Symmetry: D3
Subunit: 306 residues, 6 copies
Amino acid sequence: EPEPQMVLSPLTSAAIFLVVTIDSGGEDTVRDLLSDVASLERAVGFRAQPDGRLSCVTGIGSEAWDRLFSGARPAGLHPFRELDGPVHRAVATPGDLLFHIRASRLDLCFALATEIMGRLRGAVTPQDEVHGFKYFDERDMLGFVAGTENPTGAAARRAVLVGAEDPAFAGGSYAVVQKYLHDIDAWEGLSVEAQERVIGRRKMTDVELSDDVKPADSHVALTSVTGPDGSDLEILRDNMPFGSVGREEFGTYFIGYARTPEVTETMLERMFLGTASAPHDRILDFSTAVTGSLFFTPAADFLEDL
Amino acid sequence: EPEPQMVLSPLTSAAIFLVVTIDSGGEDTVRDLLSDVASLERAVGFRAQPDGRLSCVTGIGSEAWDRLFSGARPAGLHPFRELDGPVHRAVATPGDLLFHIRASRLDLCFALATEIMGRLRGAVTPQDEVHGFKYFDERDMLGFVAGTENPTGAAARRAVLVGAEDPAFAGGSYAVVQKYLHDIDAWEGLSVEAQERVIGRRKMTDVELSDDVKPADSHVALTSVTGPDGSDLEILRDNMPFGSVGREEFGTYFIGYARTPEVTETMLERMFLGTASAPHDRILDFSTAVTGSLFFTPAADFLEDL
Amino acid sequence: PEPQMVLSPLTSAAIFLVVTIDSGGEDTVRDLLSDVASLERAVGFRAQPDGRLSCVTGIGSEAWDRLFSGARPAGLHPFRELDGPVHRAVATPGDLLFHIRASRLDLCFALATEIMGRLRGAVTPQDEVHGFKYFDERDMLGFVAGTENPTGAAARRAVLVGAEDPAFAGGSYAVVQKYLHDIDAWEGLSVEAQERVIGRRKMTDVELSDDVKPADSHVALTSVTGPDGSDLEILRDNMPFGSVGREEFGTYFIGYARTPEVTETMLERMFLGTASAPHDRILDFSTAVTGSLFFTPAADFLED
Amino acid sequence: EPEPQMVLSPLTSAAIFLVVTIDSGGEDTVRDLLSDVASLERAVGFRAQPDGRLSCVTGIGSEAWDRLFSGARPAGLHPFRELDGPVHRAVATPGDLLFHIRASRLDLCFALATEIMGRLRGAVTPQDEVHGFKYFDERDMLGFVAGTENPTGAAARRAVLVGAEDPAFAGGSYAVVQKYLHDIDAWEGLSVEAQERVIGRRKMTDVELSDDVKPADSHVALTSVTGPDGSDLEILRDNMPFGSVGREEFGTYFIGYARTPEVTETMLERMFLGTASAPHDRILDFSTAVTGSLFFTPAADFLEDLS
Amino acid sequence: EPEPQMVLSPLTSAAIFLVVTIDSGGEDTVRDLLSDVASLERAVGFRAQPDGRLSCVTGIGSEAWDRLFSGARPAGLHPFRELDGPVHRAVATPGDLLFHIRASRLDLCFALATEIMGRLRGAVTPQDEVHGFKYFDERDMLGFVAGTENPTGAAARRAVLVGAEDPAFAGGSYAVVQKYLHDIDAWEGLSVEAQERVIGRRKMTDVELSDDVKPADSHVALTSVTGPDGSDLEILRDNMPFGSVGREEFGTYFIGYARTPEVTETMLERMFLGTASAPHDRILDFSTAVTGSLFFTPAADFLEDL
Amino acid sequence: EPEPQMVLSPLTSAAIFLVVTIDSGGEDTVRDLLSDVASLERAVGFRAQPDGRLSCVTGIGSEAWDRLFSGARPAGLHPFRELDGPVHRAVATPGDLLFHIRASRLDLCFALATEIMGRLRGAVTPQDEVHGFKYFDERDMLGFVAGTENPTGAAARRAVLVGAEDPAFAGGSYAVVQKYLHDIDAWEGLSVEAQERVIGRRKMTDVELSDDVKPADSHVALTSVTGPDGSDLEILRDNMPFGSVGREEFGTYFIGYARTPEVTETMLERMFLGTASAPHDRILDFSTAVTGSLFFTPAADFLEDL
Ligand code: HEM
Ligand code: HEM
Ligand code: HEM
Ligand code: HEM
Ligand SMILES: [Mg+2]
Ligand SMILES: [Mg+2]
Ligand SMILES: [Mg+2]
Ligand SMILES: [O]
Ligand SMILES: [O]
Ligand SMILES: [O]
Ligand SMILES: [O]
Ligand SMILES: [O]
Ligand SMILES: [O]
């Protein structure tokens, strides 16, 4: 059986998201780090157990894949597709490696990020570094409970992990990242009732709006997708608030894991391009994407045997 | 008896330090915020009891004091004194207001900082914003336990709180801040034994080096000071690690509270200018001050009664 | 097939809600059943992961016929009243059971509020009990309660419907009885006399050896061996409850099993006695004031 | 410095409020129990240290005081004063003894309530019993954070504990209890902003409404009282949610401690009878008081030195 | 004004009791260690703040006091008084220094005991070392709750701390230690009701037996003492269970703190020699004392100034 | 189908290791206790759910197996093999039964140990009893993190549990125990860099030394073993510190679970007898084995069905 990376792990109160590009001739240094990254995770995390809950998920971009490895490519791997909607745009930004670092404490994230970047100095250029913090009541930067409808157990495994459709990369997953900045002044001008119509859930109680009152351009309505079979298409999201009060930056770092990028890309199409019944997702009237990248997160044993 | 701010409260795992200057015409907006800051601390923190441990200490600079208030000035309040040592410099940087925000979680610090800065928008200019995190084993950025010789109980109250020497300001304190960036590459080039001789304590066990072994130019030696009366002069320090792995920023945010700035200033003179037996504090060969500001943190009732 | 949380452990808080379905309330009920997993997530996610909020939903025999056409679960019937020589196990009305558990009563109450809010005008409440953990997993008699519950594979085998009734695999049967205790009479016994009623040591919870365990002890009468000589097991989530002012010191009994026959055999031995035992001596200190039987379907049965 | 009961202690996650009346001839049994109540609290609580946080505050009503004790009365002790407003009524209901029991767990509350009621069986009649629970982030059944502006440290000591004004009773306090039931159907028909105008604080973030927007008939406006010298008059509230989903009971158990009942009573007069600017507290349009009792909670040493 | 050691602090889940004798010529080494013990306590304890709750109380015996110090002695400091009852004996055993180490975790106790014994190697001989542990709900090896009637708050300060009756030694206290082994076989031969008549409290619920059923020879009856003026004479007990299952050793380590040894010794006389109404404390029919030592625990500042 | 004992369970903060020999005629009493040990575990542990995490793993020695049972032996069961190296010796010491008792608290361990030994009194003779405790951030007495490279999940199950190679004993495991005492004086004389060369990892950060600097006689180098097929051969180690400060006993209690003893024995051979490039494991220059025993820990249902 192939060992997945910790893609199925739950939300934690802290995260570091590190996106880098591989400099010309940095390939060899990168391959050596990838073969050690699970051992670095154990080195930093084991002594802080059991409360630490440290994990690192490592992702590799479409272009970087061709630079690093000969042989088969994962079937779903391609650069992030820019979406030019009538009003809102999903931008594509450079990204060769993702490190999705989670723990109960920011210091354990930082210590692992320090060892990884120590090994990669002179081989990579940092593109994005975000320090995420969840609110103590599981709320995001808009004041809503975040993660409620994430799949669990066998449903999560089936939605997130590559299987027989691409057997050489079984136990892998696809990660889409987008850094969003919010217009908090505009958001806080809405009544609570208006905010609930944007999201599609009650703010205090987190109960879903019933189908007769849920607007067709609510976040929950547009990111609800049924397959040909009639079955719900699901992703696993580990979204984190981040910000700087001095710079008035109040953000959500979106990360969504799926067995194929087509599920996440369908949701993004419905959000940015809309449908017959909805011009666009009302959350984008308060949220601007400033990054967008797609990564393949291989099985742990693929990184180890390299 | 006057009610002090939470200057005596213990170290926490998260902090936000905010330093701002007051723009032209900003004084009325600032006075309104000062009269409300304790009530905002309760609004953000109460619902997160008892695990939240949210506090805010508010400080006011020498020039800002004269802009905001008529009548008496605290006896020790003056702008930070630059020290131009033969090798190392303690710089002065602008700062009218300090908010020293502590909690068990960064998101609680961030929520109070958001409310404070929301009320000050258009009246202030941000000078500095640092998000602090302690390592899970009470270690600083240099790998040493930080806080060990802080005073506690009655000795802390005597060391930190203004009393009858300045009775109109009793229950106040003086805060000096300095942001330090470390040369971690040079520090990690030392053996553990050489680092212990820089600090003056054992790294793993935190046991102080004996007087026979402890170098005259160690941090513990130079920051150990006796008054004319033979008594130890003590300050309370809430130093926090901070940084950015992508930018290679690895820092210690120094904050020290004391009943009179003369004690903190004497320690800084010994570190930066040295003594007969030591050229300077050896910690400064690995640590560059990039900010320096002095604040008076009044009694809580002083701020309430505006 | 995915079961409801019938295999989940004891928690420190619980709400037990039993209602009857009023005439014409069927459609409101079916809509709520299709939504109960989503309500559970909605309330529970506000306290992940320590909250441990779950709701197990059960349906009575008469309600089943009012709600669904086609196949019945093989073991579903109304609770069988037992009229013993001394003690009686009463059958009381109940169409729906909500077995709500969490680490905190707030999560239980918030979920109960949303469920009952959705069913207002469609159901009549019959029983509501707010259970709480009592010291080191003790009951109102001062004994540790749950010790011999099966775990892991033995729990799955004992609790979940399998191939014997394949349309309903991953279901279970719940029996509930609210008991009120005579604490005055109980505290009149020596600790040694109480140990002989239960069949375990009071402070240390060690089982009495077979040579000393009375045949009419609770542990002896509820020990049943199946055709192959293996133990027939149930999973019990008993919770203390009460009201000091009204002198109500209670045990809310709930037992899950793959077939009701196992639980019913245990109840027959307790209430009717055997050749060796007049009745379960625990009943000399405990009166059953409710009795109901429910089928707790697979989670997938409810969503569909 | 005489030793107070645990009146200054913080909110906990569980509580039992027990109100009883003393039957004729029950006085000797009650005095005996009062002399033992601190020892019973230690007997239950000590084995759950350090996390248990079990405490019991024992209060005695005006008429019970006269039956139990032959000497001096606390200066402020009198029966609860019924308030007959143009719209709303604050009823006075019987209660001789209050047990305010708090812990981090209901089991410790229940076990201590069991031991106390076991000692008083046949001497007292139960009037009210409420099992309170913390609801999410210190919320009440109206969805608002409750307790935010409670005084702390020295301010709490000054606001709550009897001192030199009544020296024989120094370290005592005065507790007012009211059981409120809420009309949740009517409450949930308001917009969140209309709820915020009833309470005077933001619902989700618990920030006080600015003075320009805070209505005069908001809860926070009517329960804000200044003394003649301009300083705030404060009380310490340990309010707890309770209820029963089947019976549609969604309750707030109000308890307020103060150094003199005059402060709590001035707040109640403003709520129920209103001011020049406000007819009544808008919170009462959604809240009905069904009990009302006043108790003196003596210093701990006063109870210990009985017979 | 004088700062007591942590004699008033509550029970913890772990303790180490270390009793040593001072070798001939060990006096100087011992004096240097005593002046450093508070600094060693902070060095170990600070890196587990705030849940560690590490503390060390240092006690000095009567014969050791006269070897270490000159001038005035604490008024009540004498060797433990052997009690030769008709049936039961309280033995006196050697001991010059007591280290009473408590924390929430054994590791912090063990690390501090290691640093102390490292400084004293070749100057002292170990007489007794006991690792204590919390047993369920504050129970002892007899199955009863132990510590229930300890004084708290002001009553504890008044019972425990030397004051104006011996002003030079204000802030000190007197510790009596006795290691007890229990005859568990004999004890378990009693019914629970017989055990309750030995102790004087209910076993499961820890409710005191009423005055009309409490035997005169029960432990609670003989250890209840009133002064000539009617007030209760109280001690503070920090008893801890210990044992070794292989050796069939089930113990109680008794430690009682009091402002004068006369209170503790009056209790011991009643237990071992009895009263007019009681031959001896029935708890002694199931408990054997194998050590007995008395120590003065000076104010913290007395040790620091050496 | 067969239910293993709790061999795969994680490290806990407390342990008791009990090794006994079966006295002549004690066989019938032992068989009765083996059939009840799981019942005793529930009796003590249930009341402390869910935080207690009490488990007992019961092991039987080679000589004991033939005294207790008729019919098939586990294929790998033999007496511990004494290793007589040029410098260091791995002694074989008597042991018929192992009880490996773990929990989050020592009380639960002690209570279960008391019930087991109460049933075995007069049938067994105790050989060793060790009370283990967690030391800071999962450290051993040498000050290094211990457990870091233990296998987890599927890799742990594959490394530890007997499968189809010995189908009658599927779900069993083999436990090797060795009690080590450390020369802390000699160890603490080494610089941290020289200690790192003994172990093969960085002391404070627990990062593995790179292959270019790791000495061939380091602990990590000698306990790293590859099968003929190139895979890593793994064991599960649940090592616990123990000690007594007055007796200068600073111990590591070694316990290693494996699907076959040949893996553990290959590691011991390399440590004690060395390789072409290493005389012996340098850790043995600071560590003396004083016990050595091998046990088969059967499937839980094997014990239940006696
Ligand atoms: C500013 C960015 C975002 C914010 C603040 C945000 C917030 C939320 C919230 C509050 C919910 C409801 C509770 C939950 O189930 O987590 C939700 C649901 C969801 N979001 Fe987002 N979201 C954002 C971006 C995205 C993006 C970019 C996607 C997909 C590409 C996405 C996919 C989903 C999905 C699939 C659900 C679950 C819908 C359901 O089936 O109920 N979100 N989000
Ligand atoms: C530049 C970055 C700094 C770092 C990384 C640092 C770190 C440390 C460490 C590790 C200790 C030993 C443990 C303890 O906290 O007692 C210490 C002690 C101390 N530091 Fe700093 N420190 C810094 C700057 C300062 C400054 C600027 C001052 C004063 C103006 C200061 C004053 C002290 C004092 C008074 C002590 C206690 C010494 C004693 O009496 O034992 N430190 N510091
Ligand atoms: C007054 C109501 C009850 C009380 C207070 C009570 C209490 C207990 C206690 C203290 C135990 C021993 C520890 C353990 O849980 O294994 C026990 C065991 C048990 N009880 Fe009950 N019980 C009650 C009613 C029932 C009922 C109504 C049934 C069955 C229909 C039942 C079935 C069992 C079973 C099967 C065991 C396990 C026996 C074994 O195999 O060891 N109980 N109960
Ligand atoms: C249905 C009954 C009640 C409910 C739901 C309720 C709820 C609240 C809420 C939500 C607050 C705002 C947060 C805070 O606690 O500071 C508050 C404040 C307060 N309440 Fe109540 N309350 C009730 C009855 C009472 C009564 C009867 C009194 C006095 C007799 C009282 C006195 C106060 C006071 C003094 C404040 C603080 C006002 C300030 O200075 O800001 N409340 N209450
Ligand atoms: Mg009978
Ligand atoms: Mg206020
Ligand atoms: Mg014996
Ligand atoms: O999301
Ligand atoms: O510092
Ligand atoms: O049960
Ligand atoms: O309130
Ligand atoms: O004691
Ligand atoms: O190891």
